Amino acid sequence: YIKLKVIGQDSSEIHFKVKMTTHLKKLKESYCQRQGVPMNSLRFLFEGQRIADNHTPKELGMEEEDVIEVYQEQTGG
Amino acid sequence: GIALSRLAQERRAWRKDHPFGFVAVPTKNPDGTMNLMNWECAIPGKKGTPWEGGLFKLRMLFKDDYPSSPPKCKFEPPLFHPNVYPSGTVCLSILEEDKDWRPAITIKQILLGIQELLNEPNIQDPKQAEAYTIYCQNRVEYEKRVRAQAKKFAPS
């Protein structure tokens, strides 16, 4: 279990506590729900790497209080 | 100039043949004359859906580039629906000139496409935060709100 700070371009900082082996797609779902933004309209980055759905914190080498960056390619819909 | 002629052709066709329960009438100007650029419409709820019993009025606004350009459809008052802006504006692929809009699309085809949109929302492109949240979390609460607003707009 590690806490992750999820940052967006809109200065949004939402924290999530996840297990080291859960697929990071669940964190995308919790960001979609807590922000009311469609999940398919967001890109999640760890370092300079787009976070895949089967990627896990253990695989990406994430640690406590690491930061994930979120981009929204749909400027209008 | 061509818009007013196309809109007048549509008004006559709607009078003669139009789907049951729908309304589509041009508004009036402050001087009483007819304004074919602003229509007051109404879309009836489908039986068997949480929308049944309610008549949801919306407004169609036409620009001078009609029918080369699509009309702007705004629900008045704004509807609780995941694809309706908090301002009432309805987005649909046929209502985006850079998408699926063609000049042949009549008023009848737009009101039917919005009617279908009510019970079958496009969850991939939500335009309202509140209805997209409730629909993707507590569907029972979503239905209760729709039925509450269906009874709110029921023809009394």
Author numbering:
A (entry chain B): 21 to 97
B (entry chain A): 3 to 158
The article reads:
Protein SUMOylation is a ubiquitylation-like post-translational modification (PTM) that is synthesized through an enzymatic cascade involving an E1 (SAE1:SAE2), an E2 (UBC9), and various E3 enzymes. In the final step of this process, the small ubiquitin-like modifier (SUMO) is transferred from the UBC9∼SUMO thioester onto a lysine residue of a protein substrate. Here, we reproduce and further investigate this approach using the human SUMOylation system and characterize the resulting mimetic of human UBC9∼SUMO1.
The covalent link between lysine introduced in position 129 of UBC9 and G97 of SUMO1 is visible, too, but the C-terminal residues of SUMO1 exhibit high B-factors due to their flexibility. Comparing our structure to those of free WT human UBC9 that were previously solved in two different space groups shows that C93 is shifted by about 1 Å compared to its position in free WT UBC9. This means that, in our conjugate, SUMO1 is linked 3 Å away from its attachment site in a real UBC9∼SUMO1 thioester conjugate, suggesting that our conjugate should serve as a suitable structural mimetic. C52 of SUMO1 and C138 of UBC9 (both from the same UBC9-SUMO1 molecule) are relatively close to each other in space, with a distance of ∼6 Å between their sulfur atoms. Our mimetic does not adopt the closed conformation observed for activated E2∼modifier molecules, instead featuring an open conformation. When scrutinizing crystal contacts, we observed that UBC9–SUMO1 molecules form a chain: UBC9–SUMO1:UBC9–SUMO1:UBC9–SUMO1… (where “–“ denotes a covalent and “:” a noncovalent interaction). In this chain, SUMO1 from one covalent conjugate is noncovalently bound to UBC9 from a neighboring mimetic molecule through the well-characterized backside interaction.
